[PDB]
Tab-separated table of C-alpha atoms and ligand atoms in Angstrom:
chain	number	residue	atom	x	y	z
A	1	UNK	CA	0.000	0.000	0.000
A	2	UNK	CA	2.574	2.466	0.850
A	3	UNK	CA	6.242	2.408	0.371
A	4	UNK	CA	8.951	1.641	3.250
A	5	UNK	CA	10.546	4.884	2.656
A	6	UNK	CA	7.254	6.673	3.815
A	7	UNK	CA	7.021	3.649	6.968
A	8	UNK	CA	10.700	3.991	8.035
A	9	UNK	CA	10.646	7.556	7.395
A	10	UNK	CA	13.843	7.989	5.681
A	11	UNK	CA	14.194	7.234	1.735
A	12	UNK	CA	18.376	6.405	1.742
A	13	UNK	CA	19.868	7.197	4.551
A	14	UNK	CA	18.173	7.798	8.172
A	15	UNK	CA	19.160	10.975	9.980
A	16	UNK	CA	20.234	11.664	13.209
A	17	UNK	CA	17.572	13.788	15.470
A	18	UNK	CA	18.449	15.717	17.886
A	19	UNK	CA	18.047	14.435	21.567
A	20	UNK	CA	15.405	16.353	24.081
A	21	UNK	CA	16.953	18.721	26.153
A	22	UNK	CA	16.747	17.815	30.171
A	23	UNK	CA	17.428	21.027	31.888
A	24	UNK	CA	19.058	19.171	34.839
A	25	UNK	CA	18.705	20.623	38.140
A	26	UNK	CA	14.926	20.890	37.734
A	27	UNK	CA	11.537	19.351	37.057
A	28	UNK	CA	10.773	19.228	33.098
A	29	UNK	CA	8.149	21.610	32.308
A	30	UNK	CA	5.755	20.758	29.131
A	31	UNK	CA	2.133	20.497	28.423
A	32	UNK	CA	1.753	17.401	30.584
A	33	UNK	CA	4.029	18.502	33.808
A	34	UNK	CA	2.311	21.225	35.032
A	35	UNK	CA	0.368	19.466	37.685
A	36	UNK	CA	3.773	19.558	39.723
A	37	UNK	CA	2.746	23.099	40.019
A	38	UNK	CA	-0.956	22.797	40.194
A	39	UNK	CA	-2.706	20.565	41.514
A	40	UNK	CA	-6.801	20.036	41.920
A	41	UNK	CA	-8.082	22.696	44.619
A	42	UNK	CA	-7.776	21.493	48.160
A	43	UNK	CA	-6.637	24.811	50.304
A	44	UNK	CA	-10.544	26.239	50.293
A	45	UNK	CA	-12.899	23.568	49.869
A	46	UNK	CA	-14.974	24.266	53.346
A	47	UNK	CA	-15.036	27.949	52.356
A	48	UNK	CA	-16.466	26.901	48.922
A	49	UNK	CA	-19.281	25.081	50.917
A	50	UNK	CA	-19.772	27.877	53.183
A	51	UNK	CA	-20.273	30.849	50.076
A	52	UNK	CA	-22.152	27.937	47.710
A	53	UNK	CA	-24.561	28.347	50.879
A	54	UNK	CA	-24.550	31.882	50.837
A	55	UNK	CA	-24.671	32.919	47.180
A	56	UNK	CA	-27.641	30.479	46.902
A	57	UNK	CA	-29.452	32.550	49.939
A	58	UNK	CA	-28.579	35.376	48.864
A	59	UNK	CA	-29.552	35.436	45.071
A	60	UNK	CA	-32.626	33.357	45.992
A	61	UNK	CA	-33.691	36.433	48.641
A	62	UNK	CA	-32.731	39.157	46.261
A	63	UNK	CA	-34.728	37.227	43.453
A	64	UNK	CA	-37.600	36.708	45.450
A	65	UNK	CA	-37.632	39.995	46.450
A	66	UNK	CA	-37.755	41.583	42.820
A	67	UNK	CA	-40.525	38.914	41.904
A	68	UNK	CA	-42.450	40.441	45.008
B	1	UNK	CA	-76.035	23.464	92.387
B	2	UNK	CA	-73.296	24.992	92.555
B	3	UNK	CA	-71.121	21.624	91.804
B	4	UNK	CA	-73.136	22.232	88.149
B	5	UNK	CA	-72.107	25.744	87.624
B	6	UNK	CA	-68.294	24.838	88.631
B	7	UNK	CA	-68.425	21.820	85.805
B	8	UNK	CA	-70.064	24.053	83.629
B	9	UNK	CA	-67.316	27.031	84.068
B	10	UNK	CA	-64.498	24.344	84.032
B	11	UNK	CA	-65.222	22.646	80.996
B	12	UNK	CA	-65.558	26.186	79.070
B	13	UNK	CA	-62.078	26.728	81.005
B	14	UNK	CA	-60.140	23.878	79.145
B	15	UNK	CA	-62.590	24.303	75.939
B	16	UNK	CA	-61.107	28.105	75.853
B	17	UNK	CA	-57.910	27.118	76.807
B	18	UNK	CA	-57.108	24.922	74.436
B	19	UNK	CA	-58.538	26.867	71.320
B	20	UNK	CA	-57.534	29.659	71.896
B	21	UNK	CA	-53.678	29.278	73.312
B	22	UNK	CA	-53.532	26.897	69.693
B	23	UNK	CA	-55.588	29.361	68.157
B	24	UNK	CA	-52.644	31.907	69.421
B	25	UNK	CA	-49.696	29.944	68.977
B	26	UNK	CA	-50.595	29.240	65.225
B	27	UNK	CA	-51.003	32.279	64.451
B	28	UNK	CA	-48.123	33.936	65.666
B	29	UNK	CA	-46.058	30.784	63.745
B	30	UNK	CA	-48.032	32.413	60.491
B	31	UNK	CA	-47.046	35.118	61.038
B	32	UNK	CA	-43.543	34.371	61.486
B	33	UNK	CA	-43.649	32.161	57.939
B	34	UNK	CA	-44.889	35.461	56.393
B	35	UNK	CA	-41.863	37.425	57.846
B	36	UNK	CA	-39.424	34.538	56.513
B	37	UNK	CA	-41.379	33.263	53.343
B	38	UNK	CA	-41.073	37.146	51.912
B	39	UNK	CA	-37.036	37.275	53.272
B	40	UNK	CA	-35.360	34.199	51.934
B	41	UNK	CA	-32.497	35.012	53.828
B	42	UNK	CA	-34.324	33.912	56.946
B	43	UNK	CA	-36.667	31.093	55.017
B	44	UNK	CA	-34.049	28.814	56.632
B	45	UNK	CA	-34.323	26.414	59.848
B	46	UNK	CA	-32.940	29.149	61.963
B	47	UNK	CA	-33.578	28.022	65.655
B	48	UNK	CA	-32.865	24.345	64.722
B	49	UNK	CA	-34.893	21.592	63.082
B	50	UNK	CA	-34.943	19.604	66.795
B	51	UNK	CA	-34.692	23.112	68.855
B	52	UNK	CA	-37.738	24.863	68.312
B	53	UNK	CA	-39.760	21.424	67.869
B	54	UNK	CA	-38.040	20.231	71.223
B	55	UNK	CA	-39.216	23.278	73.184
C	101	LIG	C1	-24.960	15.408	43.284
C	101	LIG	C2	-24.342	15.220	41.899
C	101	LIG	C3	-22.954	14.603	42.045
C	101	LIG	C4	-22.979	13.556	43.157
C	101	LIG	C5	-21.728	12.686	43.072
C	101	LIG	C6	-20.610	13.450	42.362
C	101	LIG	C7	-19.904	14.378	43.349
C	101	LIG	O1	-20.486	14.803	44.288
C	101	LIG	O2	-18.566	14.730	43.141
C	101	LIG	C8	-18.182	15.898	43.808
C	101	LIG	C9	-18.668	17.111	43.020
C	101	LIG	C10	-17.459	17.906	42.540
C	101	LIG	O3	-16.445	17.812	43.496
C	101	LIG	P1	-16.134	19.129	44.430
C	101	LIG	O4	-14.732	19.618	44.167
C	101	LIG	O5	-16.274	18.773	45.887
C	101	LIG	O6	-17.208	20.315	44.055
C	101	LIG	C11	-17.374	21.356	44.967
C	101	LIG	C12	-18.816	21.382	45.447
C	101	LIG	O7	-19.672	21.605	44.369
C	101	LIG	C13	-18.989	22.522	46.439
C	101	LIG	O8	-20.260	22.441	47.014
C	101	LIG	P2	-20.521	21.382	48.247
C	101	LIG	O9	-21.086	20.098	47.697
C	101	LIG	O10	-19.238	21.096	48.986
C	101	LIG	O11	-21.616	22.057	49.270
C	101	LIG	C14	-22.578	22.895	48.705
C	101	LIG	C15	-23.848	22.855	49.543
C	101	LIG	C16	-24.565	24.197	49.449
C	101	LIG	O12	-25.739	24.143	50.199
C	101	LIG	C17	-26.750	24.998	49.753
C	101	LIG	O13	-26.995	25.987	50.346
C	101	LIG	C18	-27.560	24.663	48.511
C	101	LIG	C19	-29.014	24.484	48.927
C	101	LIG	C20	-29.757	23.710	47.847
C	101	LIG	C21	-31.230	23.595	48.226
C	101	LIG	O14	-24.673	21.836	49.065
C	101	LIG	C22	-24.538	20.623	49.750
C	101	LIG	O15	-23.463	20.248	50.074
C	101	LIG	C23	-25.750	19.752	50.084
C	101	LIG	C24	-27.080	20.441	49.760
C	101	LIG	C25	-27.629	19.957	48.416
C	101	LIG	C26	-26.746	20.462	47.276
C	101	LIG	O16	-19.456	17.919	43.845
C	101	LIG	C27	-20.822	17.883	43.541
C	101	LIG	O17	-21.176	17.899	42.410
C	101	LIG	C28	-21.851	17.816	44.668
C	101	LIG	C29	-22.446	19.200	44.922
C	101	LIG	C30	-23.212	19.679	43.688
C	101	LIG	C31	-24.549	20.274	44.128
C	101	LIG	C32	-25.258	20.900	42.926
C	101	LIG	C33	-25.079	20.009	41.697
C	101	LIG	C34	-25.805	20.640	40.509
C	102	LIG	C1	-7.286	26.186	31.888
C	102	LIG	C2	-6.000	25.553	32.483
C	102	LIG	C3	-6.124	24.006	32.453
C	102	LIG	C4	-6.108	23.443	33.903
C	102	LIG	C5	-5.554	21.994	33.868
C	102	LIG	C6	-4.975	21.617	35.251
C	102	LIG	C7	-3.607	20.930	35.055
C	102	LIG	O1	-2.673	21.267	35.703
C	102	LIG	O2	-3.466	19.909	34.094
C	102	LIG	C8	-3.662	18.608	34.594
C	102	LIG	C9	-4.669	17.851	33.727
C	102	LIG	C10	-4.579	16.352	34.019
C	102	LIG	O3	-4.980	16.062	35.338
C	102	LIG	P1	-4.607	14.549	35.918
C	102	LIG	O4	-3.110	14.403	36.029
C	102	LIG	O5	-5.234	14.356	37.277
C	102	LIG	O6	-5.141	13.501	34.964
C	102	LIG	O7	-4.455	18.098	32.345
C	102	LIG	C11	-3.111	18.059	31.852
C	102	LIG	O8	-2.335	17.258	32.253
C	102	LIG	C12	-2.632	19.078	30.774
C	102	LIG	C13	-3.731	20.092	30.446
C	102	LIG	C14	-3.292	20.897	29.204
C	102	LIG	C15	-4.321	21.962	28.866
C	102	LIG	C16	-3.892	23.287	29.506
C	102	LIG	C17	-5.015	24.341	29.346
C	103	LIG	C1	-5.207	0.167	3.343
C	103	LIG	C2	-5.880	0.441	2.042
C	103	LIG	C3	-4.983	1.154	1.084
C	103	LIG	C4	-4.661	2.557	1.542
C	103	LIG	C5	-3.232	2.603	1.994
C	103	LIG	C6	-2.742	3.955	2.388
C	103	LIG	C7	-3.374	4.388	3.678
C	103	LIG	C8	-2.738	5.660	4.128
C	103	LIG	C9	-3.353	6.194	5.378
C	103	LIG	C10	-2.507	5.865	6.587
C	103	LIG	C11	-1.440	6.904	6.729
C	103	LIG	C12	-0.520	6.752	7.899
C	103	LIG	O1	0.433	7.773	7.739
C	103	LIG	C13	1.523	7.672	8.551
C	103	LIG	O2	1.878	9.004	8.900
C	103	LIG	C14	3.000	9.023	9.744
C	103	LIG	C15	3.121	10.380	10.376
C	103	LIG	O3	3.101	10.174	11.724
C	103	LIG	C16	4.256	8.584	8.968
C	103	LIG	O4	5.364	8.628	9.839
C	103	LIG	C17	6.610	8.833	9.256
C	103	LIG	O5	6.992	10.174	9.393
C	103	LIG	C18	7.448	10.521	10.664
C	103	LIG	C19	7.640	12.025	10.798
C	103	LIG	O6	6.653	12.689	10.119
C	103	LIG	C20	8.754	9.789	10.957
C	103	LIG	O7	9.321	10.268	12.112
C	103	LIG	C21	8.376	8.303	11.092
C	103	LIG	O8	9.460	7.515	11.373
C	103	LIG	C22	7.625	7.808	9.837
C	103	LIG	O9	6.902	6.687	10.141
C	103	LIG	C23	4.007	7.122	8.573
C	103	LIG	O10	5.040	6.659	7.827
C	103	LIG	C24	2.680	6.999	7.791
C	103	LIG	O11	2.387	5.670	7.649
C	104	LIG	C1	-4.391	32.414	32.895
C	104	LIG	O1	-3.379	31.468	33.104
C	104	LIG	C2	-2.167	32.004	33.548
C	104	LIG	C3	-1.018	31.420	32.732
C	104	LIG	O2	0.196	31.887	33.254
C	104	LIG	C4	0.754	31.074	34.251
C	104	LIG	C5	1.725	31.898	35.094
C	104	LIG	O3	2.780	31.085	35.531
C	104	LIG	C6	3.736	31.747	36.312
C	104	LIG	C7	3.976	30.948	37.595
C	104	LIG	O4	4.987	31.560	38.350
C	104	LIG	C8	5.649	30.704	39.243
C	104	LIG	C9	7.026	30.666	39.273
C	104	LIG	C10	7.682	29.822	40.154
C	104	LIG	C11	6.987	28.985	41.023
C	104	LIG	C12	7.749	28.051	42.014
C	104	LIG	C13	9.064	27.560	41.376
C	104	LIG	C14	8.110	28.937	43.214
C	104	LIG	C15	6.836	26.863	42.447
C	104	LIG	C16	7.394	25.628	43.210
C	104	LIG	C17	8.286	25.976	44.403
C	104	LIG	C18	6.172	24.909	43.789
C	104	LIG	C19	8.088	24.613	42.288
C	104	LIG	C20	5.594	29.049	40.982
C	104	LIG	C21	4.935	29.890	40.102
């Protein structure tokens, strides 16, 4: 169906690629490490239960209110 | 016959009591729901949902 050349990517002679880059001394940093620097949210989960329960009360007593 | 005028007087006692102090006490609960039904802020179970019903 197709040729080698376009399977083993090279038509003669295969070329060398350049190696990735490390950057030693510190964590790699692409598309897929960046949960090394965030992670789910965990710091204000209480507080998001506490103002869920307000902004609910409070938009359902304002809204009631204009309705009135 | 006095014995007959102290049933009598009595019995409209505890028929009076009991209508009117539920009478009273329903009310003043309806009125309450109207203060909280027209302020959702305080539509909420703000004593307790054992506290009030306890006392
Ligand atoms: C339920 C559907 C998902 C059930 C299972 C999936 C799941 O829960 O995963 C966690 C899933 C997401 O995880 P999460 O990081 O903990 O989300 C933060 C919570 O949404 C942050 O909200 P919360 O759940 O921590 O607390 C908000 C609170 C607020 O209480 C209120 O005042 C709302 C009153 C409603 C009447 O509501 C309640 O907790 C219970 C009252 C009923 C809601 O949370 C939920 O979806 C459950 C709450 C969603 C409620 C509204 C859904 C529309
Ligand atoms: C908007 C920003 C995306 C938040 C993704 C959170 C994250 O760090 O990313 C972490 C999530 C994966 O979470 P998991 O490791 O738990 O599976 O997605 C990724 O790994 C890369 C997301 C790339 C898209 C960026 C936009
Ligand atoms: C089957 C019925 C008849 C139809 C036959 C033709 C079907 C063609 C559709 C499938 C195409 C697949 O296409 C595929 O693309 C990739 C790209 O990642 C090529 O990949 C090629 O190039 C990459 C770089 O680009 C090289 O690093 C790699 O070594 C080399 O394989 C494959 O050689 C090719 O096979
Ligand atoms: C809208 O999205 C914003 C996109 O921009 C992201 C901004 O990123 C900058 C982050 O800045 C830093 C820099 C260093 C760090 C350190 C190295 C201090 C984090 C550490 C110690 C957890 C590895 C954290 C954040």
């Amino acid at each position: 169906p197709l040729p080698n050349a376009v399977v083993q990517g090279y038509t003669s002679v295969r070329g060398p690629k350049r190696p990735l880059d490390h950057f030693y001394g510190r964590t790699p940093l692409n598309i897929d490490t960046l949960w090394h620097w965030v992670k789910f949210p965990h710091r204000y989960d209480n507080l998001r239960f506490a103002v869920c329960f307000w902004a609910f009360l409070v938009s359902a007593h304002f809204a009631n209110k204009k309705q009135r | 016959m006095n014995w007959l005028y102290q049933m009598i007087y009595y019995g409209v006692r505890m028929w009076l009591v009991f209508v009117l102090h539920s009478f009273s006490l329903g009310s003043f609960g309806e009125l309450i729901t109207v203060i909280t039904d027209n302020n959702l802020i305080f539509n909420v179970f703000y004593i307790g949902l054992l506290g009030l019903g306890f006392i």
